[PDB]
């Protein structure tokens, strides 16, 4: 295992000046991460909805926002260890890839600073005390685009990627719908299940007796075919003059990207540190948060991957030949 | 190290990248635009300006009327709305 | 930081283009699997062996 560092042939009278221009303490390179996150996991034990967390009170100097998602325990290593037993799974780890596919299995976000006052930030949204992505029930109707996503959530999120939603709504751009972004993922859908409780003749059947294509497809598996040519039985037809009644039920499809909660007044991407992270209230005191989530009850052990996204800027230079220096900074949460 | 705040020693906020570099480098950073790329490493900050860009009054961010004067017709359907934007909070009418 | 070189390559250039040196591939189902865009069958004809 080797190293293939290409050099550029800078001439000796313009490399040595570049050697001793960047030598100073003000040319003095600076990087950061692209994601710039405080990545920590949270387990959801065994079909539990409410998963609260209360980090203790500290500074919030130019916090940029939340970004949560979900992933399984079986499908994710804990990278504090260089070798990970109790881990037999080998494909598309959501903790590393950008693979994310449980974002549609999520119900509510409640954010309360100091466990005292809720944060939408001075009652922005419709139900102000929390964020509601999954409105399963009818109620009065906040739904968006024939799924159960709410306008309560359709402003904080669809505008967080694209800065679109106070002026109007349109196909966001062609150059901002990236592959790990929201709009190319968001595929709402709906179907109709045949009703149960407005008539009498709905008696459901289980897969050993649920059958059509009879005599032509094998019984209960890809085996050879057997049986009788015979009328179909399972799909109660929602078509034509049979006209069997039908409930509706719907869900949405947002894989491949994480939900985003920006940290600002108008929730827009006006800059790196917004006006909320800049103010003297969040930069001069300590503030806990009783940020409780409620999710869909899933059977496998599930982690919850909140990335408090904070700055991650590293300042580097070379003060002499053969010496390199690097002062790190990650504000806030500025430790390990 | 200690002469500067941490948001200017890191350029999280602060100054343009053409501003805190030495003038020997800025004349060099634009002279090698084509072949030897250098627009990679010098950290333009964005500040997202506070101080009376956005509200303080706890505006309702969006709301949702109920129709006054709604009525049925076998071919049409006629409503009205008293959208009462009050004293403030200008509306863009496309959203 | 393993996740962080992902999600930047998307928002730097193109993502869906198969680079093979550093192996900058994607991870993308076609939308006929996660979404069963369900048509029935376009049969309307008996063919005969």
């Amino acid at each position: 295992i080797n190293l293939y560092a290409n050099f550029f042939p800078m001439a000796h009278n313009t490399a040595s000046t570049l050697e001793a221009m960047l030598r100073n303490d003000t040319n003095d390179q600076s990087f950061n991460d692209y994601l710039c996150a405080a990545n920590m996991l949270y387990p959801i034990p065994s079909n539990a909805t409410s998963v609260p967390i209360s980090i203790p009170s500290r500074n919030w100097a130019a916090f940029r926002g939340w970004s949560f998602t979900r992933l399984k325990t079986k499908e994710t290593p804990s990278l504090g260890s260089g070798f990970d037993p109790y881990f037999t799974y080998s494909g598309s780890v959501p903790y590393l890839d950008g693979t994310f596919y449980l974002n549609h299995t999520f119900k509510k976000v409640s954010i309360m600073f100091d466990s005292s006052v809720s944060w939408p930030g001075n009652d922005r949204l419709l139900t102000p005390n929390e964020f509601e992505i999954k409105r399963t029930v009818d109620g009065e109707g906040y739904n968006v685009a024939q799924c159960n996503m709410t306008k309560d959530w359709f402003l904080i999120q669809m505008l967080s990627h694209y800065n679109i939603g106070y002026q109007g709504f349109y196909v966001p751009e062609s150059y901002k719908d990236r592959m790990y972004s929201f709009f190319r993922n968001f595929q709402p859908m709906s179907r109709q299940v045949v009703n149960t409780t407005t008539y009498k003749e709905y008696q459901n059947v289980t897969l050993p007796f649920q059958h059509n294509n009879s005599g032509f497809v094998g019984y209960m598996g890809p085996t050879m075919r057997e049986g009788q040519a015979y009328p179909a039985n399972y799909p109660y037809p929602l078509i034509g003059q049979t006209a069997v009644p039908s409930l509706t039920q719907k869900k949405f499809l947002c894989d491949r990207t994480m939900w985003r909660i920006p940290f600002s007044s108008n929730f827009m991407s006006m800059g790196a540190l917004t006006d909320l992270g800049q103010n003297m209230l969040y930069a001069n005191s300590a503030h806990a948060l009783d940020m409780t989530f409620e999710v869909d009850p899933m059977d496998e052990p599930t982690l919850l991957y909140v990335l408090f996204e904070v700055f991650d800027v590293v300042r580097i230079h070379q003060p002499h030949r053969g010496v390199i220096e690097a002062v790190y900074l990650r504000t806030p949460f500025s430790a390990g | 190290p200690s002469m500067m705040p941490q948001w200017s020693y890191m350029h999280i906020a602060g100054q343009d990248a053409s501003e805190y570099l030495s003038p020997g480098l800025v004349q060099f950073a634009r002279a090698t635009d084509t072949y030897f790329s250098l627009g990679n490493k010098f950290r333009n900050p964005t500040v997202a300006p506070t101080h009376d860009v956005t509200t303080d009054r706890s505006q309702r961010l969006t709301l949702r009327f109920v129709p006054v004067d709604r009525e049925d017709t076998a071919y049409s359907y006629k409503v009205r709305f008293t959208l009462a934007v009050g004293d403030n909070r200008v509306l863009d009418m496309a959203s | 930081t393993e996740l962080s070189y992902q999600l930047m390559l998307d928002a730097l250039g193109d993502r869906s283009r198969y680079f093979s040196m550093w192996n900058q591939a994607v991870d993308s189902y076609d939308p006929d699997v996660r979404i069963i865009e369900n048509h029935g069958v376009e049969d309307e004809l008996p063919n005969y062996c």
């Binding site: 950061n32 692209y34 710039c36 996150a37 991407s269 | 990248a17 053409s18 950073a29 634009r30 627009g39 | -």
Partner: peptide, 12 residues
């Protein structure tokens, strides 16, 4: 432009 350094983080 001509030169014009840049820095873009998550969520532009």
């Amino acid at each position: 432009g001509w030169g014009l350094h840049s820095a873009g983080m998550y969520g532009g």
